[PDB]
Design a protein around this ligand. Structure first.
Ligand SMILES: Nc1ncnc2c1ncn2[C@@H]1O[C@H](COP(=O)(O)OP(=O)(O)OP(=O)(O)O)[C@@H](O)[C@H]1O
Ligand SMILES: [Mg+2]
Lengths: 428, 22
């Protein structure tokens, strides 16, 4: 197999490691000279970083030698390939950083592209050093429910980049915690789509963007630093949306987007229709193309569900060097009020509404439940438009008794609030 | 021994400054 001792790896300037860790595989990395980034986040010299169950590049800004250990890797198959599209990301950031200091308020960029083109990675890198160079707090807006970032899956989010991201996490970092940690956690703004993929409820997804946009505006109006800073909006692939791209128009208007980044080549006809479709609103001067990034590998479904699984655990228990202690509470059937969104394979159409849910072992076991701020007695119009407090896992639906075992993120009472069921399941 | 926190409400997040975290 591999080996459980350290190995030296001299990684040439301008090159990526490119790593694909799978089940259980644990990679510890320690730098003793040079400059290395993971999507822009620098690695501190002389301390141990640990990686689990995700594919990621380690980039060499400078000369760089490091020590690594992993039983699932060997010197034989190591992969060290020179990245060329890196400079594209550089003079795209300083392009944004010029807008930040010259304009009255910072740029609001959508990163739009095909399936696995580098959107999220590009989003992360641009955040990663909007902060590194002149201390901005760009607002990062994740609009892809399948991608868990700072939260659990199945929800769009807005998160300001306070300081450094966690380099050793596919989820960028994590939400605030009860004490103080060696990394400054983030305060996210979550909305909860709740469903597997966008096409399951089109209007509800846009309704999410609607109310997320509103809140984003209210902070931008009140926070000088975030408003002065940029705003980086990551979208799902256009193979998840309509041909005419009706959704993008709605993203652009509700989130006040003024600049668009299209990860596109110059034989791809997507570039042309982007110009004719969004040029009228943004102006062709404000639409940019980026030749697709090096090293961006295909991602299958199993890996993606794995990453979603990791995040759910991560929300309740944290990571290796975080270790959060969530709370398990016994609760009656009457102690809960639960709704669920309209599907395609449930409601045929799929409109902005939620149906009351009867408690069935097949309905709630291992289900992630979104907890709102609205009352237990509120009507559906109030619940569909009330902010999300946090999430809860249901362990056991005992049906012979009227009882439930719910895992909470906070040690305390079951928040007597209205709750929405998701399509997301987690069993330990 | 620590735990995850609840998120802030809509208005409450809008007023929030990340300098409190730092
Ligand atoms: N330079 C690189 N070297 C190695 N792997 C990379 C590099 N850049 C990105 N990746 C990996 O490729 C995978 C897909 O990239 P990414 O998540 O950016 O796709 P995307 O553009 O968001 O598209 P989608 O939204 O469909 O996933 C990720 O797991 C990421 O870690
Ligand atoms: Mg993405």
């Amino acid at each position: 197999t591999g080996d459980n001792e350290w190995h030296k790896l001299v990684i040439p300037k301008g090159s990526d490691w490119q790593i694909d860790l799978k089940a259980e595989g644990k990679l510890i990395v320690k730098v003793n000279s040079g400059i290395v980034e993971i999507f822009g986040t620098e690695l501190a010299v002389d301390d141990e970083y640990t990686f689990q169950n995700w594919k990621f590049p380690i980039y060499a800004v400078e000369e760089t030698e490091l020590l690594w250990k992993c039983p699932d890797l060997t010197t034989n198959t190591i992969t060290v390939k020179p990245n060329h599209t890196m400079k594209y990301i550089y003079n795209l950031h300083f392009m944004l950083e010029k807008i930040r200091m010259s304009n009255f308020e910072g740029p609001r960029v959508v990163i739009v592209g095909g399936s696995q083109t580098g959107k999220t990675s590009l989003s992360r890198t641009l955040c990663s050093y909007a902060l590194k160079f002149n201390a901005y707090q760009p607002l990062y807006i994740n609009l892809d429910p399948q991608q868990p970032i700072f939260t659990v899956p199945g929800c769009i989010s807005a998160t300001p980049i306070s300081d450094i991201l966690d380099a050793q996490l596919p989820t960028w970092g994590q939400s605030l915690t009860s004490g103080a940690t060696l990394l400054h956690n983030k305060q996210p703004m979550v909305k909860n789509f709740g469903l597997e993929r966008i096409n399951e409820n089109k209007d509800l997804y846009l309704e999410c963007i609607s109310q997320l946009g509103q809140v984003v505006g209210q902070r931008l109006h009140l926070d000088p630093q975030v408003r002065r800073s940029g705003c980086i909006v990551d979208t799902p692939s256009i193979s998840q949306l309509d041909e005419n791209l009706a959704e993008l128009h709605h993203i652009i208007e509700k989130l006040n987007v003024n600049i668009m980044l299209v990860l596109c080549s110059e034989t791809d006809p997507l570039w042309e229709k982007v110009k004719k479709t969004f040029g009228p609103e943004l102006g062709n001067n404000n639409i940019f193309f980026i030749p697709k990034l090096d090293g961006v590998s295909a991602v299958d479904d199993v890996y993606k569900r794995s990453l979603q699984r990791t995040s759910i655990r991560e929300y309740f228990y944290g990571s290796l060097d975080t270790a959060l202690s969530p709370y398990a509470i016994g609760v009656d059937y009457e102690d809960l009020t639960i709704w669920k969104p309209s599907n395609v394979f449930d409601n045929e159409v799929g409109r902005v509404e939620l149906f009351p849910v009867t408690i069935t072992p097949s309905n709630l076991q291992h289900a992630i439940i979104a907890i709102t701020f609205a009352e237990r007695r509120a009507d559906q119009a109030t619940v569909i438009k009330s902010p999300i407090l946090g999430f809860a896992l249901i362990t056991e639906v005992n049906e012979k008794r009227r009882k439930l075992r719910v895992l909470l993120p906070v040690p305390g009472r079951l928040p007597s609030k209205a709750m929405i069921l998701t399509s997301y399941r987690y069993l330990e | 021994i620590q735990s995850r926190n609840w998120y802030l409400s809509d208005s409450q997040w809008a007023a929030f400054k990340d300098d409190e975290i730092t």
